[PDB]
Amino acid sequence: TDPMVSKGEELFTGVVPILVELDGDVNGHKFSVSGEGEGDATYGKLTLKFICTTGKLPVPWPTLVTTLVLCFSRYPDHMKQHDFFKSAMPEGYVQERTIFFKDDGNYKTRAEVKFEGDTLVNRIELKGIDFKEDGNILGHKLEYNYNSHNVYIMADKQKNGIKSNFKIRHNIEDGSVQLADHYQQNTPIGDGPVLLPDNHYLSTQSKLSKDPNEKRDHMVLLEFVTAAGITLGMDELYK
Questions:
Q1: Is 179 helix (H, G, I), strand (E, B) or coil?
Q2: Burial of 57 (0-12, 13-18, 19+ CB in 10 A)
Q3: Overall number of domains in the chain
Q4: Domain that holds residue 87
Q5: What is the CATH number of the domain that holds 7?
Q6: DSSP 3-state assignment of 9?
Q7: How many CA atoms lie within 13 A of 222 on its CB side?
């Protein structure tokens, strides 16, 4: 229909292999994470297994879920002209976040998301500062679980990209919650054209599990992301 959505969508037809690379440093605790799996953007479906290749992960796995490929979001047909993430491919986009853990430290992340051949690669640098060595993060007090969210995507026309801020609440074992306030910006890597979206949101669902045969520190993630929020015309079709 739109030759630009055709280009982006053609890159994400079928199952696409995914590689995630994360080099991390939180309060000087250095670590690396490697992730492998596949994404099926027609269903907004991600199946990823992450391993800490440097030993024990010094932060809880749930705190890294958002950092560790929104181009696999399912954009329904009536919204596909608002899919910035795929429109930037194959050259990719830069995704930058600051994640403020309330009453604790913050992560600062910079990632390049792009195709290397048929593989969608998410290459991340994470820097965390001002964490409490006995707090919920460095103290590993967070439940190994995750919640569904609705994050609002806004155009950032000045930067020919998008931005978003949203709150994630990690369950603490004692029963409280640890707030992680996300500030996000995405900008295309090359000088090619992109689709700048109307305001909309992404609805997420994530299941974390363990591989019984994996002796390394790891996370299995089953995640679905669907776009929504531009429905004036569609709603009228049904009076």
A1: strand
A2: buried
A3: 1
A4: 3-236
A5: 2.40.155.10
A6: helix
A7: 5
